[PDB]
Amino acid sequence: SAKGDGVTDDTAALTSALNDTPVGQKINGNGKTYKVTSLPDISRFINTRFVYERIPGQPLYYASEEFVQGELFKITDTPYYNAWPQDKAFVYENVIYAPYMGSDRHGVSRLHVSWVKSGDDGQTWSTPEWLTDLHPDYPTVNYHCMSMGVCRNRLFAMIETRTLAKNALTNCALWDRPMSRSLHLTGGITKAANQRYATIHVPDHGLFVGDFVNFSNSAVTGVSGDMTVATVIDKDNFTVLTPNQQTSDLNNAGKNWHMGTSFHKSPWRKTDLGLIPSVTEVHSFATIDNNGFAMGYHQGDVAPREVGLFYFPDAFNSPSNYVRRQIPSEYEPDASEPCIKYYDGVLYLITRGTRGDRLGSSLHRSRDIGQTWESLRFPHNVHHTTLPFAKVGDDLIMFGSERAENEWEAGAPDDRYKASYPRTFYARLNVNNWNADDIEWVNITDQIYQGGIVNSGVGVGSVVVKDNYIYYMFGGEDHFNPWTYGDNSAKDPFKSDGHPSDLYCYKMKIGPDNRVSRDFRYGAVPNRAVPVFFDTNGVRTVPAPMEFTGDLGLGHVTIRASTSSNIRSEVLMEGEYGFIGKSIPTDNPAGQRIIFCGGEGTSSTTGAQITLYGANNTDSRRIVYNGDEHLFQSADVKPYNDNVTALGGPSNRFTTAYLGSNPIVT
Amino acid sequence: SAKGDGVTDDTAALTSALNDTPVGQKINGNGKTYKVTSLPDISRFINTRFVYERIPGQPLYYASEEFVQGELFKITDTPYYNAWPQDKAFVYENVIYAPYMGSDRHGVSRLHVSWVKSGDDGQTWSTPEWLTDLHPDYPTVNYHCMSMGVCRNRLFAMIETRTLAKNALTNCALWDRPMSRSLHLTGGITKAANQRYATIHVPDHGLFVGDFVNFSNSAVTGVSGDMTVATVIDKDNFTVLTPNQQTSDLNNAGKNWHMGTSFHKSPWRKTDLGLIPSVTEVHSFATIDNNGFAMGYHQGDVAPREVGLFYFPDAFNSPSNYVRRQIPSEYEPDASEPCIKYYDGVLYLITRGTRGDRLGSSLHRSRDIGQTWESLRFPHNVHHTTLPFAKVGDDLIMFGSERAENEWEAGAPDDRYKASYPRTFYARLNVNNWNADDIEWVNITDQIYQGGIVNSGVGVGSVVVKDNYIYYMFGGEDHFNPWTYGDNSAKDPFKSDGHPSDLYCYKMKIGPDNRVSRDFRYGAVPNRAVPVFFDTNGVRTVPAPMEFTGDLGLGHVTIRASTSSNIRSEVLMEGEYGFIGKSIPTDNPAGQRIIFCGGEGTSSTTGAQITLYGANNTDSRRIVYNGDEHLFQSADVKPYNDNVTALGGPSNRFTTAYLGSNPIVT
Amino acid sequence: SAKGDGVTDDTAALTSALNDTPVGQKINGNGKTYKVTSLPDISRFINTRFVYERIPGQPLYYASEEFVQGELFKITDTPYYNAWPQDKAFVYENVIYAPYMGSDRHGVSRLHVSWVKSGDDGQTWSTPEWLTDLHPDYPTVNYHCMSMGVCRNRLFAMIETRTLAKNALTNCALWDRPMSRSLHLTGGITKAANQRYATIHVPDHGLFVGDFVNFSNSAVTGVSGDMTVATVIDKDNFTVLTPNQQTSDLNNAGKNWHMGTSFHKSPWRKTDLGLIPSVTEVHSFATIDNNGFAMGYHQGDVAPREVGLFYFPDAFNSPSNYVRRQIPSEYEPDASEPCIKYYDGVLYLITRGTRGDRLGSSLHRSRDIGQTWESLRFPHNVHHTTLPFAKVGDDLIMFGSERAENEWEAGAPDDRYKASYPRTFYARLNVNNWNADDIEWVNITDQIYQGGIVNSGVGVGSVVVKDNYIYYMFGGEDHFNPWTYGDNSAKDPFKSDGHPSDLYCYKMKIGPDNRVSRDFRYGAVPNRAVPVFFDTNGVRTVPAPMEFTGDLGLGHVTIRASTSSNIRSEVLMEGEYGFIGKSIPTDNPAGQRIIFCGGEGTSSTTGAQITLYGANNTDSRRIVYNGDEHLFQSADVKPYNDNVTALGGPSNRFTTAYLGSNPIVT
């Protein structure tokens, strides 16, 4: 029988057990770790961990079901190349946000900075939202983002411009916007007499001039409904400009009212930082305090490599002021994409290793926001993955994913161009012991690497904590080829299965749950993206406004009454001009034409008609105007050219002309 | 070690066990109840119940995973405010129906009485269907319904008319419709000679004159296909009007045939009941027998409050005749929304308590349909929730939900305007012991209350039994703010995340299951709402008819051949008139125009053209008519005004005029 | 206590156990089989099998949860009648294919041969794809397919033509197409001097002249991008015509490059086989080798019945050449739809039994591709189901489904026209033991048969192995009536809930899994079928091109700039002609008209206008042309008829006519 001490070879014991029990029996390993020389049938165990040396000298750990309290979710399912949550995730007012980039490749082509959000602690996720448009100068350049977070109720993002041609960095800008919230407040509004401004006391409001604010039950005349911030007095007070003045001071103290903000109705604040010298990518976001934050960065295009952070001490008053700070220079070679987080006055930083045959990922802490560091090397050249993390109690909990199967270990060659099942790990490291020598990387879930192209969307994720769960948001593929090598070298997302990469989220229990289960099985018709309702007439009805930007083929079409108390049906045409034309008929091009009719049918019996004949028509380019009255209003009836065409013809005479004077023949 | 006797404090023993076992180990409580002073990590237990007194003197019970055989499902996911299944659910011919109201708020604004249904015992649910239109007098008033059910194969519903302004009741009507069914029959059709009618024997058909009936393989000439009920002879017999008569008698005795009904092609019968005096809400539905049913009601607008039911003895012959029956007067204060159900000659009624500081929910039974009652009070002022229920064996099984977290208990203050996790409970009550003093409310799932507005959509549900499962259908929110206090005071469902309230269903096993599992994991593309198919050309194709009522923006559009043996493409315009117009160009307003062409391109080479120039065009309001023929048919070519406009001009002369007589100059 | 020896009656033991244990306790049967005279509460057991004789003398087995490592998925959800995966499933380059027919009934009406695919080992499935169009002579005949598979990287299908009227077979054709692949290759391309063809060495390419091939990084001038196969030299070599030639030879030996294939951009090869004599249905597919394959068939319309296969020895060079081979004549009566598979030089065939009261399904094997056979009979007249299977180790693993509940057993009468829960079974048979006398059929999942019509979509499935799982793809229904006997005798899929039959897949573990779990919960918005993204303006945006073929009702419509550098908005009309017309208005028909306008509003102020008045208008069939110029280009302005209409009128006089010559009057 098995020792389960994590050192004694249990292979043979475990094999005997499996052969001796029925396949349906969940063998309970009692939370112990069993050393093996080959992985057994993991699916037959619960509450079991395995230590296994795929590559001798590099032990890795493997969790059976129920070893950790955890679950994998698939959180996007879109034809875009969906990847790079790195390192933008955050939670705000109970909502979990998973930003990423949806593109058509490793690059900024067709790219939108996007997010999906969860309102239910990760069970269920929202329809993707585009945060950025394509750049004005597309397709020369487009946006890109790997650093996003929240500081004092505003979203802050380092929005980069990069070339489509080489993904070369061109511009860095700090964009920020207030987050949408509802506040239920008591007092705080004052309006002095004989002037129109009211001042609002909202602690750490994070609003700027022109940002949206809406008011309910204020009890101060004029402070009502949709308004904008007129001035900001300080971090806790601002004013709105009302439409009226009164001859007595108002003051809503003691009264319960409501505000009022909106991400979507407030403009971005965009602060151009130019081409920050010596930067390849800005990556990760660490809220420091009420005034500012840090974003990570590295430079890896030319020697020497840099890895560090930019600290923005006061991003509210001075968004363009930041200070660069570098990790110790011995950890900078072969490093990139640092993840940074800030906890009780300590800033933690973990690097990506670029190579399996060089010193890889390292960990650093500072008590002065990067001026001085204490540092530590992860054993065995951890590489190709970022290591996003959170601190829970004394532990840094970090997650990582090899990009393709069997690439994790030191000295493991890249292995692309064939379908595989890359491993995802997490590890705990205690900040007090500050030693990585014995870190245990635990394989908790396996993803798919498609193999159709060299690049992989798997991993390169982001981590947040909400209440007693930690969430690792990361990319994963499926086996559907994008056909880059095939009929889709243009990388059109909307051909066939589009791009295989989508987002997943591993949700792990991190503390006690003192509540009954909130989990449900989803059995609903998903009805947010294209809300469909069967009308009383039994026909599918979509009440949401929508944009179709791809080419549309329609069958029979009815334009219903919709405009001006529904007196009319309306089609409006945009652009410089609109064109309504007629294809060449496939079977009978000799009939080519459009009939315009003021009545319900093709018979002129039903209403006035004008019929435009195609060039292919038997009656080439003929026009027939058919009504019971032809009335020409507001201008003369004239030929385009001079002394070129006539009124009537020998076989089409008008009976006469009713004139107010004799013709002017000239 | 823990005693698990439901009285001895097991907190310390349970804590010791938790610390001493691995986190992945499911701790088995052996179906026992453990008293605690704080809830432990419930997620680590299986088959375990906790008794806990959050509020001293008020024990509630808490189920670990697997203590009951039950599972929560989410059954809608719609931007509408989806709530109030109360109390309308029913099962009919294997389909579970979950009616509700989808609106934009606690009120009748934008509201459609709706339902979703399950065809697979609750695993999977249908696209929402609207059962009512917006009221003809919208937006002054609109429909509302909390009472619906099935009697003798017809749906019966109390459709209320209520004002948008104050949700004041305005009108009560009984609407009913036959349910859709397929009948596989033998005999029952007779056709007497020399007349065009046929009589159909169908026991308890429940149809009315004008209702839809379809026939197959009748073997009675003329009784075939789509038809309607011409007269109803009695509950078991009706006639249809065929297109022909025979000179000998017809009688399909001994022959197997099929009928034939439809909810959708039969009109509602609407019986106007007026403004039923002394009624606030009609709520719940209890089928009594083959001829009628009772609906619950309450009056809570003015003293004295009333709580009771309306019995409709014969809803088929006399839909407008009903009798009011009230519960005992002592139970009527602080009570509303009674749930009513009828079993083996006993009518059961459970009230909603309106406040936590007053005697709450009570249960009543009657052997004479509400003339006399036996009554009992639930301990500790059960409030804010309806208590829909079913009788299984000797037990009433009831479900309830607090509307926000920690509101359930007696004396618990309302706690709104902050996000929380409201508890949902069920309880068993033995009808022979008829005593609620020791009722055990068991917390079986937790919901979310969003907190962005005072109102909550959680709970207020409905209950049905199908085979050996009971189902509780009720509302629940998520963390997505509606932004009522924000950019969406107008409460528009299709802005941002719409309204967070949606429907869930708790499915609980209630008797033995003598079959292998029917459960599946859903892995399909949901393809009912907007059925999409990749055509052979690789383009997504929707074959279903559809209505888009919200503003549409389209890109490139082709109108394909579709009408009159596909000889033509067709666009029909509705309303009093149609308008096809041209927006003001953004970049080059001087170009504003629409080109109408009988050919395929902008070049007039491809076909006849009419070009309408906008007022902003360099050639302001010009029209250019361009054809190789301009032929004016059916009427004179005239100026709109008299002696105002000319034919030609000095720089635009017609070569001549071909006339059949000299001009008439006058 | 229970013996669990599979022969001793354990009913009372088991009953006492259930009575003495809490309902939440999963009772472990330790992989043992328990004989019962009634099925107990299966839901309360884990790792337990039951032997039970519903029909005395006919033992069947019943699996509790966790007895097998297996799970059911639902893989289609479509209003079409989705059924008959029989017997077309296959795996190709890590993708699982589940082809089927989506129709409106048991017949070829509205039918499209279709498939859904899995990219993740069966967790998740794709949007349905149509493989065939409606037949050109629809609705007289249409397509049908029950045999499909892969041989040497081509898809091969027997596409049948059958009448809508009687489902009678009319034509058989072999359709084939190359499968899409990405190949990552080293060397193999040579291009001889002074000619333009590059020959490509790709072993077993399976391509034909005209098939699509795409090249990247070839390092051979001209061999680049999208190309087509010019000639095929042999099975390992083909050429592409390059744009150019060189004076010296080229050979990329040692250079890495990529190809390049496409199912969608390559035409079908269609080989007409005529109406193959004495065939009712071609069914099932067995790849024999690199050159060809076998397809099963049966003839069941006239005596004598035939069951066998058609062997196509070289489908590449001679698609039209096949040889008929039949199973031994004693096994032909009452048999149909053979499933065939080929393993290690042995061809296996299992038949469908057509009735429960005659010798049923039989198994056969041959080492000469059907010339001689060794045969065996399944006990108890197995009938109404095909038995698709795979060989894993020494075992044939087969699956079958009764079509409605309790039809499986010998002598069991069909039981249609009532909703039921039909049993699905699997069985193992060792080919070295070659005796079915003690076959154990294990009920592993229960489906639903709707009952609204006699026909059943359940079962008639298909089986594949991928890695260490076996997959059974089959049909199953739900409780939603199609209303064939009701308001939808026309069987329109898009009314109400359409057709209840859809596809499911049972995924069963068949070998050890040496990896951590790949499973996830699906929490995304399904966004492949109609990809929706909230744009930066907060509106749902669909960027994919789409076709709507069903009648569309639209509200307010804006045609946005789309065409020719987005200078213009564009609507093109197809067919022989386009029609734009105006419905009869409901409220004010006397207003019937369309206003066409070159500007933004209904006021003529905004642009030139032409208004067509309906016949219903007060000004019946009036046209009003309103611009500040009316210019008639390219042609004379003429009346349609000769000397019938005038220019002007007594109350609508032109001021004069500007002419280059006097009127020509006649």
Ligand SMILES: CC(=O)N[C@H]1[C@H]([C@H](O)[C@H](O)CO)O[C@@](O[C@H](CO)[C@@H](O)[C@@H]2O[C@@](O)(C(=O)O)C[C@H](O)[C@H]2NC(C)=O)(C(=O)O)C[C@@H]1O
């Ligand atoms: C499920 C369905 O679509 N049932 C329809 C059937 C069905 O098409 C046929 O029974 C064949 O399967 O037909 C029904 O109408 C039939 C049409 O065949 C009848 O109207 C008969 O049509 C005749 O033309 C004929 O010869 O068949 C004349 C005959 O007298 C008709 N029978 C009667 C009773 O009038 C049907 O009623 O069976 C309609 C049904 O929805």
